[PDB]
Structure formats: structure tokens, C-alpha cells
Amino acid sequence: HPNAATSDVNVTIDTFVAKLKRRQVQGSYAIALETLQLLMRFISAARWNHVNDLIEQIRDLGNSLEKAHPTAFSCGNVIRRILAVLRDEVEEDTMSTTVVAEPLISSMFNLLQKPKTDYRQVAIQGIKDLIDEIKNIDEGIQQIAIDLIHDHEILLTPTPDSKTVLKFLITARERSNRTFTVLVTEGFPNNTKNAHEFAKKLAQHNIETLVVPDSAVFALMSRVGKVIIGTKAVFVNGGTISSNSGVSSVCECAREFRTPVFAVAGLYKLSPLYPFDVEKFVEFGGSQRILPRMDPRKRLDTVNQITDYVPPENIDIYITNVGGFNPSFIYRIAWDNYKQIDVHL
Amino acid sequence: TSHCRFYENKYPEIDDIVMVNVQQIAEMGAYVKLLEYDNIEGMILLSELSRRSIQKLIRVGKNDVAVVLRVDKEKGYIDLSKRRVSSEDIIKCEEKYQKSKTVHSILRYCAEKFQIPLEELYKTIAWPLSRKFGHAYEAFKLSIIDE
Amino acid sequence: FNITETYLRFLEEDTEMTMPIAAIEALVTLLRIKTPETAAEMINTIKSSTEELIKSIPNSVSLRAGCDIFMRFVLRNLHLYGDWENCKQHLIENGQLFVSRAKKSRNKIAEIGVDFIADDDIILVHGYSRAVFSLLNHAANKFIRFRCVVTESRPSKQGNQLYTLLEQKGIPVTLIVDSAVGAVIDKVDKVFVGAEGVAESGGIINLVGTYSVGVLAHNARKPFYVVTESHKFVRMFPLSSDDLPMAGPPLDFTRRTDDLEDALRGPTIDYTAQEYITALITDLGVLTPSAVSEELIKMWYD
Amino acid sequence: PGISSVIPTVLEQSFDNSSLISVKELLLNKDLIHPSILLLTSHLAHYKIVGSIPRCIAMLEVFQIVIKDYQTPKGTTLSRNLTSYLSHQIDLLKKARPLSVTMGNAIRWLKQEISLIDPSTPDKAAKKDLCEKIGQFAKEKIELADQLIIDNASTQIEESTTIVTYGSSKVLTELLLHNAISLKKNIKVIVVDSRPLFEGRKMAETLRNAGVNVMYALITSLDTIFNDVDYVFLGAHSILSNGFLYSRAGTAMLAMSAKRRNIPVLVCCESLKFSQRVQLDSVTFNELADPNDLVNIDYENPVERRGNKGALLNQFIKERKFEKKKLAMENKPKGNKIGGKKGSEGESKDASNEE
């Protein structure tokens, strides 16, 4: 389905498309908020009267949105989240229009046994609940996370870019009973500016700050207590795409030294998609920021990448608003929020 | 020796109510024995014995309440159902089981004293008491007041 | 009427219609003749026929797993307290519909599991399964570049059989021995393995050298794959590295011989632990570790 | 009200996460507490037999006694001062010994039962049905469930096998006793022990009383006994959300060796034993005890010697600190036998959502 029907009534589709492609929109948290407001505008304005035609139209809109921007997983997840909230209430509604439906638990096995209302209002409130969930994640993290780190323990941190992780770290430092030393890898080609702001906010709160070059990670790994990841997107197998530069090597460095790896994330950040190849999912950077002068750049073919991937073999915990989960279990948390059909849009 | 059926015929029918003492669990349901209709096995399936997690429920414990669905009157195969029995009928199922248990206790002193088979004594009693009078418990209550 | 004889009739047949799905189809045919209405007369005779099937088994696991799923579906039929006739008709029909589901699942997987094989990747394949080879063929249909390395598996010379079936497609190959398989893990991008069974724990039930592949790949940090159709799940938990259901030898040491007759005896089926598997692929979505157990808990309701 | 603060030994520079104190000899208390609680707290303070499993069974029986002794006041209803009295019990239990996970699930079950029954039914009719329900609850979740673990393990263990164990777990004692008597196999059982408590010693004693081929060993000597060993059974205390094995002292050491030396670790567990609290190292929340148990010089628990060690407070830094409850690493165990039959520790929380 094209945007020919939604042009005069809905204009904000194309402005979000413009915000993605030229990267005017920044940070998964913000991308999610916009798509929420998009779906808010879609239900409030449209006229449908039919339900199945409506849902499949939403599926096509989400399909086009993910094709417009591949790194906007938070875009794709939010739509998929509302899709499933819709689908449950429709399946509840069809049971009343026809007239045991309660075997034991909420399982799977969709290959075995076969099969006017206020539905739109529920769809409205379903968006509102998603916003409030994205608004408050930190409260759900701090009750699980600030139980695992001890006094006189040194914390090494790749990806200082995450707003989520920094605020988790500040709530722990607020506790006068807890003392920890912070090592921060720079992440030269991208994270530098963000890493420097990270080091500034730690000094602002008076926490023992240590700025580390990306070479020196090995030269400290014997002294490191724990490793924390500021992830962007979490996957089925467990693995993460993080907010740029110098993570993968640090995780490899941690595993060889058998140093524990922590990850702080949200369920909206969590994705039901599978990373079959890193080659497709990871976004590459601009080599302009590395080396000046273009006549030597004929011979200097420089390689730089923004997003960094970690395989599930390294990290052990994904502390969310719900709780702490192991990478060998995180798939269930995903299927508790997104349906099997709501993947290939 | 503890044998012989409570009623006249060996195999039950459709809609008749019985009480089972559990002797089996899991997989199919339970290959067991009855306390209302003979001591031979009569099987049920898990679904019937659930209605409504389950790993704490029956596990070959005491006695339940079941109704016979399918009877094979050739070699010996019985099917039952727990859910189907209504709440008003459950009390009547318990009273019939209590009546059957009292009849079985009565026809056990006879086999112990004179050293004669229990099945012959059960046959000679169940003709005026069980068939003509109504039941053997009320006939015994009539015999003690005035023979 | 027999069930073992019906399974023996599939000699020149096989392929697409899998070995377990042919045993399930044989279970439905035996069920539909002698009245499925009676639950006392029939289920006990079904259990005796499965017991006779297990006693006739020399080296197979999946037939025991396929019976379980059938049983489960039969019991679930009359879970709604429906008409004892409409539920029976739906049970008999779900036999041909079960075999038809093997087609639909293969249609699903061969479009999902082609994504894992990226642009120009050298593959080392071990343990032939119908699902993994269907990925390999329908990726060639997708016109994607991939190199293939043949492992010399020794059950009944399977490596040579695998090599010939790869020749009939148009993909360049060469023979690699399972002894030298350690010397290959540097020029190989990814290692793919097809399973004979997947454990309750998350481990694998497989052939004459698969654990060895799993460990070496864990050392070399190169990915290790499991691709199958979703029916090979037993409530089995091999506690140790060398404990499995067998009709033959669990490592025999023979006396002094001169004519040379008693020799071969080694573990033909081997287990590997949950940690060694990087990824698992079935028609039930894209899922690997605890997913198998969740499935089993969902089935058994225990 | 009770005695609080003022503790023996140093506060310690390293490891100060939990309380190290408490009442052993009865002095200054409230005169309303039921004596069966006072008995159990005096028991658990210096207990030699219990280890996770039996503690809850005793706690349930004590509660059953209290309800049987409970007579409802004419003014105040049933759910008025009961829950405060129970909170006084738990606080006294906490002062004596930090509670297990299974204890918490019992308290949660009891507090659910208080809310379920409304003050409208007669008093003697209420408590008669209550204790019957608790008895059935203890029958299902413990005794029957234990029997289910027994038979699940029975299929798993091969004929004529060597087993190395640790601790004083009720489930495993009965397991091995079942193997020796009912199944009649050639089971060589080796038991290991630590310093603070001779738990394995007691287990070996009970196995000897059955008439079992028993070797008895220590943590110091393992690279000699292993070089023989097949299956290793560990006494579970709690398996967390991740699938980490929170258990007694010399557990993880054994777990490591077994993983290294081919033939792995198996763990028997209860469906009541699982929690939702998660951790990754032994430092997180440890069950610390007073160095008074480590004063004795070898052999037995009461010996009373004029030895080498004696001072802790006056000595310039001499932290003789021992721990009781440790954490085995996730990957190392392989089997868990529970109410819901089987499942690897990688799966872990497929019981918590199943309830």
C-alpha cells in the first residue's frame, strides 16, 4: 500500500521519513516517540469500520517504515508492540461475537489445535501505556541492577552514549554505601565527544573518573571488576547492537579475562528480529573524520563503522524495567510482547 | 480373598455413576481399580480428570467421582469421565459409594468364619436384598428392627 | 494390520515425506480402522504397537519422538468436550494433514534459513538432514554465492553419499576427513550440522562425530549450526557425554583375535552440550537455546 | 522486645555485606511468643543436621501447632493480631539464622490463606479445615514431589556406579538409601566435608547405618580421589532466575573439578526452591556466621583445647572469616530434577511463570 490515500489527512508520515534518511532524528528513544505519535495520528484521523483491513494496512505501513530506515529498530518494534495488543483484543472480541478457552498456561504451539465495540478506545489507551513505559524504565532497572555491584570494584564502560546507563550509574553513586571506580573507553571516531561529556557528568557527581584510550583496554583487564554495555538494540539470540565504536574488542577482552559483562536496556529497545548476519545490520561511518586530504585518500582506503555488534557468548544479564534475564531466556520476554506473525511485515 | 462385583452383572453401562481408587498416573490417564463396580481396571484420560496445576492434584491418592462412558462387554475395557458429574449428583455418588463399602464390609465376616468363597456368599445375598428390596444397606436396617 | 511392515515398505521412496512423518502416517492408518471412539480398546493397543516398534528399533530415536506428538494431538482433540464423532473425524483427517505440514514447513524454512548464508561464505557441512540440504538447494535457487566442504562421516559411508548429492546441483566440493577436520577451521566461515534429535537441555543427538566438531568450533570461535524440521524433540536428558539409548554396543573391548573379525566397535551416536550450539533453525521461528525446552514444557504440560 | 547490636569479632575491611551477630542463651524477651518457635530458633542457631529442605518442613509443622493452639479472641477477629504475631516470629527467626527461599514461599502461602478466609465462619470449623489444607500442601509440594525426584533420578543413574556427594540434603540421603535397598546396585558413595559443619560426616554415618560402601574425604584432598568418579550430586538450596546454583560451602570447587574431569554435575531440586532474586558472585548475599565454630582444633565439634588460636578482638587484624552459602557458576551443572520432571539450568525460570 502507498501513501497516496494518506497525504492531505496525514502529512507527518513523510516528515518522519525525511528525519530518518537525512538523520535529523537521533537516538532510538526519540524514534520510538515519533512512531507512537504517528500511530496516534493514524487512529484518531482515519475511518475504517472494518478490523482485518485496518490491521493489514498498519502492517504495510510498518513494512514501508522499516524499508525506509534499517537502523530504526525502535520504529519497527513499537508498531509490532501495538499490533500484538490489537490482535489479542480482536481474538477476545471474536469469542463474544460467535457466542475450554483456558488449558493451563500461555504457551505457543500454533501448529496444533485450530481456532460495534470499544476496540478503538483500547487501541488509544494501548499507545498511552507504551509511552508511559518508555517514559519510566529507570525505576524498573534500579531495583534489580543496584544489587550486583560491590565496594572497591572497578567498572569499565564501552558506549558512554546511552542516556539509560549513565542515569543507572548516577542512582548507584547516590547511595553513600556504594563506592566504585569508572574506566571509560574513548571510542575515537564517533563516541569521543559523548565520552568526554560522560566523564564530565561523573566528575559533576564526584565519582572516580578514568578516561581510557582504546588501546589500553588490555592493559587494565586484570584490574577490572565488571563490564557494562550501553546497548541500542537487543536481539533474539541475546546479542546486541550498541551505540557505536569499541565494544566488541572490549567484550572479547573481558571474556578472555573472565570478567563479567552487564547490559542495560528496555523492552521497546528489545527486538523480535534475528541477526543472521552482522554484515547487513551494522551501519558504517564516515571516513572523513579519520584522515584529511583527498589526493592521498585515493590510496588511503580507510575503514570506519558506527554501530558495533556483540555476540551472546559474552554478556550475562539484561536488566530491564521488568527485571534481570539471561541471554538464553530473553527470547521469551520478546514473545511475551510480540507475536510470531508480526515479524515479516 | 477380596473379589466379586458389587452389582449383578460384571460390566457397567452408560450414564451409571462409580467411585475409583487411583492406582496409576500420567501419559494416558490412569489404569486403576474401582470401589463401586468390581476390582478390575477401568481407564480414564487426563483431559477428563482436569476440567478446571496438576503435578500436585491426584497422584494415586484417595477417591474421586466418575461416570462411565464406554464399556466393552466382550473382553474387558472400561472408559470413565470426572467432569461430567454435576455438583448435586456428587453427593449422591458419595452416598452410593458409602452404601457399597458397607455391603462389602458386611460380606467379609461370612468368608472368614466358615472358610467358604466370598463370591458364592455375594451371589446368594444379592437376589432379594439388592434386586427386589432396592439396596442391601436399607434391607439390613429393616432386618435389625424386625426380621 | 502391522505398523513395522508399513514402515519397511518405504525403501525406494523416502525424501520430502520424512522417516518420522511416515511413522506418524502409519500410526493414523492403524488408528482409523478399529474404531477410535473407544479410549480403552484402542489407546492400550496403540501403546503396545509403539512398544513393539521400540523393540524392533536398532539405531533410531526420532520414531519415539513422533509417536508422542501424535498421542498429544489425539488427547487434545476432545479437550473441548465436543461431539464424539466430529472430534474423531478431525483426528483421522490430521494424519494426511500432518504429512502435508512437512511440505509447508520446508517451504517456510528454505526462505527463512537462507539469510544466515551471507555473501561469499565457505561452509563445512556435517550430518546430512533434509532441512539443511533444502536450505543449500534453495539458496542456489536464490542465486547466492557459497562454497562447500564435505566431511567424511563414517556410519555407512555417508560422506560419499553427501558428496554425490551435492554434485547433482552445481556447487564446487572436495573431500575432508573427520580426522583432519581440525585443520580446516580457519578457511571455513561457518559450520552447519543437521540433527537426529534435539535435547530437553538444549544439546544435540547426532551421528559418528559431531561433538568433536562442536568443541573444535568453540575453540576456533567459528559458528556452529543446527537446522531441522520441528518434530525431533524427545523428553530426553543425556546426563553425561557418553549416555544414550542403544540396542547395540556401549564401547566393547574384545579378546585376542587372529582372523580379524571383532574390531569396529565405537560410539555411533554422540551427544554435545548446549553451549556449543551458536544457532538453531526450525519452522517454529528463529530460536536456539532454552526455546527447545519451552516447546517441550508447552507440549507435556508438566 | 529482644537484644540488638553489640557484636563479637572485628567489623572486617573485606566482606561486610550481611549481619554477623542475636540470642543464644535466653535473656530479656516478650512473654507471648510460642515456645515451639523458641525451640526452633535455638535449634537453627547451632544446628548440625538441617540444610535448606528440612528447615521448611519443621517451620510448617510449628505453624500447624500454632493454628491448633490458636483460639480466636471475642473482641479482635482472626486477621487482626495474627499477622503481627507471625511477623514477630520471622523477625526472631531472622535474628537466629537467615531464612531460606523455601521458607519465604511458605510465608507467602500462609499470608495468601489468611486473606482467603474471611472472619465470618466459626473458629473450630475454620482451623480444622486450615491445618488439613496445609497438610495436603506439604504432602504434595514436599513428600510426593520428593518421591517424584526419586524415580526421575532412578532412570538417570546407570547400573553399578560411583557417586560423590556433598552436604546434608534430605533429598539425596533418601535417594542413595533408595538405591542401596530397593534397586540393589553396586553404588560406591564418596562424601566430602568442610570445616564449619560436619554435614557430610552425618550423611556418611546414616549411609553406614544402611550398610553402604562409603569413602569419606575432604576438600584439601580431591586431585587424589578423582584419580573413579562418575556422577556428582549437589545439595540444592536455591536456583536463581539466571540458573546460578546458590548452595553450601564446598560445592563450587567440586563442580569445577567435575566439569574439568569429563563426567559432570547433577542437582536434585524442589519446585518451591526457585526464587526470582538474581546474583552472579558469592560476595552478593552471603550467610555469614560467627568464628566461634572455627575455634576448635580438628576432629569433633566439642573438644575444648588450650591450642594456638583464641583471640580475635584484641589481635591486630586477624580475620578468620568463613562463609556458608556460595554460588556455583551457571554452565557447570547439567541436570535439574524437580516436580515438573526435568530441565537444564540454562532454562531455569520455566517453573516461576508456570507457578
Curated annotation (Swiss-Prot), chain A:
One of its GO terms (biological process) is regulation of translational initiation. The keyword Cytoplasm applies. Its main location: cytoplasm. One of its GO terms (cellular component) is eukaryotic translation initiation factor 2B complex. The keyword Cytoplasm applies. It is found in: Cytoplasm, Cytosol. GO terms for molecular function: enzyme regulator activity; translation initiation factor activity. Keywords: Cytoplasm, Initiation factor, Protein biosynthesis, Translation regulation. Component of the translation initiation factor 2B (eIF2B) complex which is a heterodecamer of two sets of five different subunits: alpha, beta, gamma, delta and epsilon. Subunits alpha, beta and delta comprise a regulatory subcomplex and subunits epsilon and gamma comprise a catalytic subcomplex. Within the complex, the hexameric regulatory complex resides at the center, with the two heterodimeric catalytic subcomplexes bound on opposite sides. PANTHER family: TRANSLATION INITIATION FACTOR EIF-2B SUBUNIT BETA. Acts as a component of the translation initiation factor 2B (eIF2B) complex, which catalyzes the exchange of GDP for GTP on the eukaryotic initiation factor 2 (eIF2) complex gamma subunit. Its guanine nucleotide exchange factor activity is repressed when bound to eIF2 complex phosphorylated on the alpha subunit, thereby limiting the amount of methionyl-initiator methionine tRNA available to the ribosome and consequently global translation is repressed.
Swiss-Prot record, chain B:
One of its GO terms (biological process) is formation of translation preinitiation complex. Coiled coil: none annotated. The keyword Cytoplasm applies. Transmembrane segments: none annotated. GO terms for cellular component: cytoplasm; cytoplasmic stress granule; cytosol; eukaryotic 48S preinitiation complex; eukaryotic translation initiation factor 2 complex; multi-eIF complex; ribosome. Residues 15-83 form the S1 motif domain. Its main location: cytoplasm. The keyword Transit peptide does not apply. eIF-2 functions in the early steps of protein synthesis by forming a ternary complex with GTP and initiator tRNA. This complex binds to a 40S ribosomal subunit, followed by mRNA binding to form a 43S pre-initiation complex. Junction of the 60S ribosomal subunit to form the 80S initiation complex is preceded by hydrolysis of the GTP bound to eIF-2 and release of an eIF-2-GDP binary complex. In order for eIF-2 to recycle and catalyze another round of initiation, the GDP bound to eIF-2 must exchange with GTP by way of a reaction catalyzed by eIF2B. Eukaryotic translation initiation factor 2 eIF2 is a heterotrimeric complex composed of an alpha, a beta and a gamma subunit. The factors eIF-1, eIF-2, eIF-3, TIF5/eIF-5 and methionyl-tRNAi form a multifactor complex (MFC) that may bind to the 40S ribosome. Interacts with CDC123; the interaction is direct. Interacts with GCD1. This is Eukaryotic translation initiation factor 2 subunit alpha. It comes from Saccharomyces cerevisiae (strain ATCC 204508 / S288c). The gene is SUI2. The chain holds residues 3 to 152 of 304 of the full protein.
From Swiss-Prot, chain C:
One of its GO terms (biological process) is positive regulation of cellular response to amino acid starvation. The keyword Repressor applies. GO terms for molecular function: enzyme regulator activity; translation initiation factor activity. Belongs to the eIF-2B alpha/beta/delta subunits family. Component of the translation initiation factor 2B (eIF2B) complex which is a heterodecamer of two sets of five different subunits: alpha, beta, gamma, delta and epsilon. Subunits alpha, beta and delta comprise a regulatory subcomplex and subunits epsilon and gamma comprise a catalytic subcomplex. Within the complex, the hexameric regulatory complex resides at the center, with the two heterodimeric catalytic subcomplexes bound on opposite sides. PANTHER family: TRANSLATION INITIATION FACTOR EIF-2B SUBUNIT ALPHA. This is Translation initiation factor eIF2B subunit alpha. It comes from Saccharomyces cerevisiae (strain ATCC 204508 / S288c).
From Swiss-Prot, chain D:
Residues 328-355 are annotated as: Disordered. GO terms for cellular component: cytosol; eukaryotic translation initiation factor 2B complex; guanyl-nucleotide exchange factor complex. Keywords: Acetylation, Cytoplasm, Initiation factor, Phosphoprotein, Protein biosynthesis, Repressor, Translation regulation. GO terms for biological process: cytoplasmic translational initiation; regulation of translational initiation. GO terms for molecular function: enzyme regulator activity; translation initiation factor activity. It is found in: Cytoplasm, Cytosol. Its main location: cytoplasm. Residues 342-352 have a biased composition (Basic and acidic residues). It comes from the Eukaryota. Present with 10300 molecules/cell in log phase SD medium. Component of the translation initiation factor 2B (eIF2B) complex which is a heterodecamer of two sets of five different subunits: alpha, beta, gamma, delta and epsilon. Subunits alpha, beta and delta comprise a regulatory subcomplex and subunits epsilon and gamma comprise a catalytic subcomplex. Within the complex, the hexameric regulatory complex resides at the center, with the two heterodimeric catalytic subcomplexes bound on opposite sides. Belongs to the eIF-2B alpha/beta/delta subunits family. This is Translation initiation factor eIF2B subunit delta. The gene is GCD2. The chain holds residues 237 to 593 of 651 of the full protein.
